């Protein structure tokens, strides 16, 4: 299958997931430094004011987008009882690194500076899955450089490093849906050169992680990325940041996307909801 | 250093913890087959009908009681938005196995039979922490055999078996609050003879786990009980029972008790909150 075909399949497959009713949906364009960034804004059923979650889809920096992540974002919105803003950052190979990073930061800055549009008096948070969790974490680092104060970061099986060494990568790199071959091919599309592996915007593990917002980190037992996820949690804790690190046993990478038929996915969406409700609202 | 003095310290360094407001609170006394069983019923701030959680304090079958678990059970009620019933089972060493099990099943039998007194149309669940988690898992086994149909079980770092062999036991058996010496001493206070190690009511892992209620099982990373908690989960799964097994990283046995100072503890309370709201109300 071609790259385009597979992109199409993502959205096709998503029409099999039930779409939860929410408050209100709005498609906006965000004025970004290098491009115009599409975003969908999900309102909850409760009434403002609100905390705001800026969300970044996974997909290896190659795949995924707003439509195919529409069911997940609805379910997060109902769970978090928060405004959710799903970002369509530019995708490789058409747009190499650090395009998806520029888009993701621009989007956040913008939402942060326009939070009254969404009655977003309760603060901003970032989150994402996989490649998207990478974008969230990097976005939160860049934020510190700009004195943007975020409430929270929700990192769902994030990718946080180039990896040739984790046990989890070797234990789990075949037979569990996301394979080694996939990780390599993703990296080939996304990166310009070998020099990019020195860049904290690709491997956020590289950064000074002090004074980042408190975090929820979800890893998956049978996931090659498991160990690096927990390393990121560990280094955060080391740099004096509060973090709740949580491994869901018995599941594979991506499992949150599959909440309709993997109940542990539903329960993670539940945990994500709770910690955001708690930091925004005190609940 | 004696049993009564040890008990006393628990209750005292637990008196300081600020208590969360709930709806209303009623002490009851259940007609036990062997004793009168005190219990404290916690109502949420929302209004019925309700699901009911029968909860069992930990403390190694030797410590713990209703007063000292009063902060936690309040916290649980608001999270689960569910009628919580704190059960004051007979303690060792004065009352040996299977005393605490008899009480724990008697109390559940009774709450099941008298659910309109609490307005529990949405059914019954069991839960507890540590030895408390044991009590709850055994109770659910005993319920199956008498066709008592439970909605859910919540097992928070459970003790599920006599253990000389797990990695987590050797890796985590010193330095992490709950130690080899303690596991041994508790088991000596609690058990009658070596023949009790054969008894599924001390080691629930022994039992046929078919047709039990779906479970949340929380383990702690630096916890000697971690591996057995996780085995219980996988054994349920092999037996056709849905379960969501979750390892909280960076934390010890007992961490949930410490939710005022340990934020992973609070977040755990929120997950339990969530899974009970889900199965009881659909929320």
Domain layout of chain A by residue ranges: 1-283
Q: What is the 3-state secondary structure (H, E, C) of chain A?
A: CCHHHHHHHHHHHHCCCCCCCCCEEEEEEEECCCCEEEEEEEECCCCCCCCEEEEECCCCCCCCCCCCCHHHHHHHHHHHCCEEEEECCCCCCCCCCCHHHHHHHHHHHHHHHCHHHHCCCCCEEEEEECHHHHHHHHHHHHHHHCCCCCCEEEEECCCCCCCCCCHHHHHHCCCCCCCHHHHHHHHHHHCCCHHHHHCCCCCHHHCCCCCCCCEEEEEEEECCCHHHHHHHHHHHHHCCCCEEEEEEEEEECCHHHHCCCCHHHHHHHHHHHHHHHHHHHCC
Q: Between the CA atoms of A175, A181, A186 and A187, what dihedral angle is there, to the nearest 10 degrees?
A: 130
What is d(CA B20, CA B43) in angstroms, rounded to the nearest whole number?
A: 12
What is d(CA A266, CA A260) in angstroms, rounded to the nearest whole number?
A: 7
Inter-residue contact B94 to B168 (CB < 8 Å): no
Method: X-ray
What is d(CA A17, CA B272) in angstroms, rounded to the nearest whole number?
A: 25
**Backbone phi, then psi, for A155, in 5-degree steps?**
-110, 105
Chain B residues in contact with A267 (beta carbon < 8 A): 216, 244, 246, 271, 274-275, 278
A139 to A151, A262, B123: CA distances (angstroms): 13, 29, 45
The resolution, in Å, is 2.3
Which residues, in sequence order, are CB contacts of A35 under 8 Å at separation 6+?
Answer: A90, A103
* B8/chain A closest Cα distance in angstroms: 32
Helices (H) and strands (E) in chain B, counts: 8, 8
Q: How many CB atoms lie within 10 A of CB A121?
A: 13
Chain center to CA of A135? 6
B263 to A141, A209, A265, B233: CA distances (angstroms): 22, 19, 22, 24
What is d(CA B251, CA B264) in angstroms, rounded to the nearest whole number?
A: 8
Please give the CATH superfamily to which domain A1-283 belongs.
Answer: Alpha/Beta hydrolase fold, catalytic domain (3.40.50.1820)
**Any idea which residues of B carry the catalytic annotation?**
130, 223, 253
Q: If 0-12 CB within 10 Å is exposed, 13-18 middle and 19+ buried, where does residue A77 land? A: buried
For B244, the enclosing helix (H) or strand (E) is strand B243-248
**SS3 label, residue B267:** helix
Give the number of C-alpha atoms closer than 13 A to the C-alpha of residue A255, restricted to the C-beta side: 25
- C-alpha angle with apex A173: A172 to A175, nearest 5 degrees? 75
Nearest residue, CB atoms, A270 vs list B233, B234, B271: B271
What is d(CA A32, CA A237) in angstroms, rounded to the nearest whole number?
A: 33
What is d(CA A17, CA A70) in angstroms, rounded to the nearest whole number?
A: 9
B107 to B51, B67, B94, B247: CA distances (angstroms): 16, 18, 20, 30
**Backbone phi, then psi, for B178, in 5-degree steps?**
-90, 115
**SS3 label, residue B160:** coil
Is residue B231 left, alpha or beta, with left meaning phi > 0 and alpha meaning psi from -120 to 50? alpha
Long-range contact pairs involving A145-148 (C-beta distance under 8 Å, separation at least 24): A146/A109, A148/A108, A148/A109, A148/A112
What is d(CA A71, CA A263) in angstroms, rounded to the nearest whole number?
A: 15
Classify residue B153 by its DSSP letter.
E
Q: How many residues does chain A have?
A: 283
For B227, the enclosing helix (H) or strand (E) is helix B226-238
Inter-residue contact B245 to B228 (CB < 8 Å): no
Strand partners, B55: B86, B127
What is the rounded end-to-end Cα distance, in angstroms, of chain A? 47
Interface of chain A toward chain B, CB-CB under 8 angstroms: 214, 216, 230, 233-234, 237, 242-250, 263-264, 266-267, 270-271, 273-275, 278
What is d(CA B278, CA A24) in angstroms, rounded to the nearest whole number?
A: 23
Q: Are residues A271 and B274, on separate chains, in Cβ contact within 8 Å?
A: yes
Classify residue B4 by its DSSP letter.
H
What is d(CA A99, CA A190) in angstroms, rounded to the nearest whole number?
A: 9
Of the listed A57, A103, A253, A257, which one is catalytic?
A253
Which residues, in sequence order, are CB contacts of A236 under 8 Å at separation 6+?
Answer: A209, A212, A215, A217, A243
A137 to A105, A202, A273: CA distances (angstroms): 10, 10, 18
What is d(CA A62, CA A4) in angstroms, rounded to the nearest whole number?
A: 10
Inter-residue contact B249 to A221 (CB < 8 Å): no
Helix axis angle for B131-145 and B99-113, nearest 10°, is 60
What tokens does B184 get?
A: 């041994």
Chain B residues in contact with A234 (beta carbon < 8 A): 250
What tokens does A85 get?
A: 């803003």
Q: Are residues B249 and A247, on separate chains, in Cβ contact within 8 Å?
A: yes
- C-alpha angle with apex B178: B176 to B184, nearest 5 degrees? 135
What is d(CA B228, CA B245) in angstroms, rounded to the nearest whole number?
A: 12
What is d(CA A280, CA A8) in angstroms, rounded to the nearest whole number?
A: 36
What is d(CA B78, CA A50) in angstroms, rounded to the nearest whole number?
A: 21
What is d(CA A67, CA A56) in angstroms, rounded to the nearest whole number?
A: 12
């Amino acid at each position: 299958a071609s790259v385009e075909e597979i992109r199409s399949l993502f959205k096709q497959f998503s029409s099999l997931t039930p779409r939860e009713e929410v408050g209100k949906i709005e498609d906006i364009t965000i004025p970004g430094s290098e491009t115009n960034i599409k975003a969908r804004v999900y309102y909850p059923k409760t009434q403002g004011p609100y905390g705001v979650l800026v969300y970044y889809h996974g997909g290896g920096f190659v795949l995924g987008d707003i439509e195919s992540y529409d069911p997940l974002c609805r379910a997060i919105t109902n769970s978090c009882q928060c405004v959710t803003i799903s970002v369509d950052y530019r995708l490789a190979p058409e747009n190499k690194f650090p395009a998806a990073v520029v888009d993701s930061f621009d989007a956040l800055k913008w939402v942060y500076n326009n939070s009254e549009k969404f009655n977003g008096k309760y603060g901003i948070a970032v989150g994402g899955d996989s490649a998207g969790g990478n974008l969230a974490a990097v976005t939160a680092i860049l934020s510190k450089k700009e004195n943007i104060k975020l409430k929270y970061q929700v990192l769902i099986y994030p990718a946080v490093s180039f990896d040739l060494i984790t046990k989890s990568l070797y234990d789990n790199g075949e037979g569990f849906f996301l394979t080694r071959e996939h990780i390599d091919w993703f990296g080939q599309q996304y990166l310009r050169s070998f020099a990019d592996l020195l860049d904290f915007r690709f491997s956020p593990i590289l950064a000074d992680l002090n004074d980042l917002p408190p975090a929820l980190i979800i890893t998956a037992e049978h996931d090659p990325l498991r160990d690096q996820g927990e390393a990121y949690a560990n280094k955060l804790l080391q740099s004096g940041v509060q973090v709740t690190s949580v491994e869901f046993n018995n599941v594979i990478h991506g499992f949150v996307s599959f909440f309709p038929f993997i109940e542990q996915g539903r329960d993670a969406i539940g945990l994500i909801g709770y910690v955001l409700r708690k930091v925004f609202y005190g609940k």
